[PDB]
Paper text:
[name] ([name]) is an evolutionary conserved protein implicated in many biological processes; however, its primary molecular function remains unknown. [name] is a highly conserved protein found in the cytosol of eukaryotic cells from yeast to humans. Our work reveals that the iron coordination mode in [name] is very similar to that of iron-containing extradiol dioxygenases, which also display a similar structural fold.
To confirm the iron-binding site, we generated H49A and [name] mutants, along with H192A and D189N variants, because the latter residues are located in the proximity of the bound iron and were previously proposed to belong to the metal-binding site of the protein. All the mutant proteins were properly folded as shown by NMR. Consistent with the crucial role of C244 in metal binding, no metal density was found in the [name] variant of [name] crystallized in the presence of copper.
Residue numbers in the entry: 4 to 297
């Protein structure tokens, strides 16, 4: 049995040198003023750090490392035909900063729901959408580096009913101030290379239409409304890569509202990998945001 998941995208999606990566993350985090501490959930991108690291800092700066003790990371599956969610087979997730330990107690509880499959080590290491949050998490939590655990969850192509069921399942954990939910997603992938060319001419340039479409989705997320978000996906089919983890989060939020809790979500930074101006251009969008529970 292999006990460690190697940092299989280090050096290609982010800097492999621990000390240099540490300084790069520190630099991006220093440019952000914390406004939403202590975040109970964040939405953050999963592209290479050269493209999205500055944006992701706006989410990670909202984590209060003196409060958060367990960090769920829900990332969408890119390679495998997964219809449910999957849990890791290893005990430790490596990063160039320091290695992260999976919460064995919660992993046992989750497994006993019967709702999860077990992803192989090969599946685990092939996916990047969880790994891209490990260095940032390690950096955000370094002042308490030996006092927190992670709960990695691979999120497949969930049906609406599975988004509802997993949302209700995770809601009991979302209600605990010691827990943090990292919801991994990029926003619009625009261009012929993505077979996506939706364009609202009332917005002007293509990149402004992309910004408007993304921000329609971001505003719906801020309305805490999973049905509205599903309807928006059905209407425009925006290529939001973590739409299923987001659907899980929104259903968890509505479950907590039914239990009498009150919540607020705010997006804090929006960016595009480039600015599309003609039909042959392509770009990927990034958005960072935080959920506050009082
Ligand atoms: N170096 C990595 C990452 C490259 C990368 O991050 N590309 C951007 C687009 S310029 C991106 O957004 N990737 C994640 C996504 O498409 O959602 C690779 O070769 O795939």
């Amino acid at each position: 049995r292999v006990v460690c998941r190697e940092a299989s995208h280090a050096g290609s999606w982010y800097t492999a040198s621990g000390p240099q990566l540490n300084a790069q993350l520190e630099g991006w985090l220093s440019q952000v003023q914390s406004t939403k501490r202590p975040a109970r959930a964040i939405i953050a991108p999963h592209a290479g750090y050269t493209y999205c690291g500055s944006c992701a800092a706006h989410a990670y700066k909202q984590v209060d490392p003196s409060i958060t003790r367990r960090i769920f990371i829900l990332g969408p599956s890119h390679h495998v035909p997964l219809s449910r969610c999957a849990l890791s087979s290893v005990d430790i997730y490596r990063t160039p900063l320091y290695d992260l330990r999976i919460d064995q107690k919660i992993y046992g509880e989750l497994w006993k729901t019967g709702m999860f499959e077990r992803m192989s080590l090969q599946t685990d290491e092939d996916e990047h959408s969880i790994e891209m949050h490990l260095p940032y998490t390690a950096k955000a939590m370094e002042s308490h580096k030996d006092e927190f655990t992670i709960i990695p969850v691979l999120v497949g192509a969930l049906s609406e009913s599975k988004e509802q069921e997993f949302g209700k399942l995770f809601s009991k954990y979302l209600a605990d101030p010691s827990n943090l939910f990292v919801v991994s997603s990029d926003f619009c992938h625009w261009g012929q290379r993505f077979r996506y060319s939706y364009y609202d001419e009332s917005q002007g340039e293509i990149y402004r239409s992309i910004e408007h479409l993304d921000k329609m989705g971001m505003s719906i997320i801020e309305q805490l409304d999973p049905v509205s978000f599903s309807n928006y996906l059905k209407k425009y089919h925006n290529t939001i890569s973590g739409r299923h983890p987001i659907g899980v989060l929104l259903n968890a939020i509505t479950e907590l509202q039914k239990n009498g809790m009150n919540m607020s979500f705010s997006f804090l930074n929006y960016a595009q990998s480039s600015q599309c101006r003609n039909w042959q251009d392509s770009s990927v969008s990034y958005a960072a945001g935080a959920l506050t529970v009082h």
